[PDB]
Amino acid sequence: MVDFAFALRKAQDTGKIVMGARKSIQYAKMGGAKLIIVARNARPDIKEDIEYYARLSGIPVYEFEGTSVELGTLLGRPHTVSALAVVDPGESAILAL
Amino acid sequence: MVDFAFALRKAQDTGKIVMGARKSIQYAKMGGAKLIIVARNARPDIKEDIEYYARLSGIPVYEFEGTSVELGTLLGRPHTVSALAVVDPGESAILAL
């Protein structure tokens, strides 16, 4: 990952992202996302859940170094965000390896 | 992941793959691979190790449903293979989501 916060902003403004543990799980499970992002302190059960389905389908998982509070802030949401999925990167390089 | 065994064969024959736990760890750690594959029964410490570094860099990890013995067989190696990395997919669709 390169310049995560910038890449995330670019995806959010120009692409399509979906926020929340359940929705991200639905994606890791069913497909339909290009990348799942988890907060470092996302509750263990949620992280393991996402990680299991992500390995099942080969969807990449990226751990945001910071907290669910910091991730919510980065996303401009009035609440914590523990996980999200990138459905379309838009003009972002967030998927670049 | 779609038609894993076929996709893997195509990457192996037309792209670049690297086999082994240490080499895959080096990739998950330093970048340079597009996908890490782990056998279902790869020893837990090795899986966790790869999985940690993969999350650090957002490199996708795919779990092969079968054993390290079966994975070695699939790769035509005379030994078990617990993990590998796809450096170049070649003509393969192994990276498609």
Author numbering:
A (entry chain B), B (entry chain A): 0 to 96
Give the authors' words:
We have selected two salt-bridges (E6/R92 and K46/E62), which are located on opposite sides of T. celer L30e. The crystal structures of the E6A/R92A, K46A/E62A, and E90A/R92A variants were determined at resolution ranging from 1.8 to 2.0 Å. The root-mean-square deviations (r.m.s.d.) between Cα atoms of the wild-type L30e and its variants were <0.5 Å, suggesting there were no major structural change in these variants. The values of ΔΔGint were in the range of 1.9–3.6 kJ mol−1 for the pairs of charged residues (E6/R92 and E62/K46) involved in salt-bridges. The average values of ΔΔGint for the salt-bridges E6/R92 and E62/K46 were 2.3±0.3 and 3.9±0.3, respectively, while the value for the control pair was 0.6±0.3 kJ mol−1. Take the double-mutant cycle of E6A/R92A as an example. Removal of a negative charge by E6A substitution from the wild-type L30e resulted in an increase of ΔCp for 0.8 kJ mol−1 K−1. On the other hand, the difference in ΔCp between R92A and E6A/R92A was only −0.1 kJ mol−1 K−1. These data suggest that the two substitutions are not independent, and the pair-wise interaction between E6A and R92A affects the ΔCp. For the double-mutant cycles involving the breakage of a salt-bridge, the values of ΔΔCp(int) were −0.8±0.4 and −0.9±0.5 kJ mol−1 K−1 for E6A/R92A and E62A/K46A, respectively.
For example, we have shown that the thermophilic ribosomal protein L30e from Thermococcus celer has a ΔCp value of ∼5 kJ mol−1 K−1, which is much smaller than the value of ∼10 kJ mol−1 K−1 obtained for the mesophilic L30e from yeast. To study the contribution of charge-charge interactions to the thermostability and the reduced ΔCp of thermophilic proteins, our group had systematically removed 26 surface charges on T. celer L30e by single charge-to-alanine substitutions. We used the double-mutant cycle to investigate the effect of pair-wise interaction of two salt bridges (E6/R92 and E62/K46) on protein thermostability and ΔCp. Since thermophilic proteins tend to have more salt-bridges than their mesophilic homologs, our observation that salt-bridge reduces ΔCp may provide a general mechanism for enhancing thermostability - thermophilic proteins have more stabilizing salt-bridges that reduce the ΔCp, leading to the up-shifting and broadening of the protein stability curve.
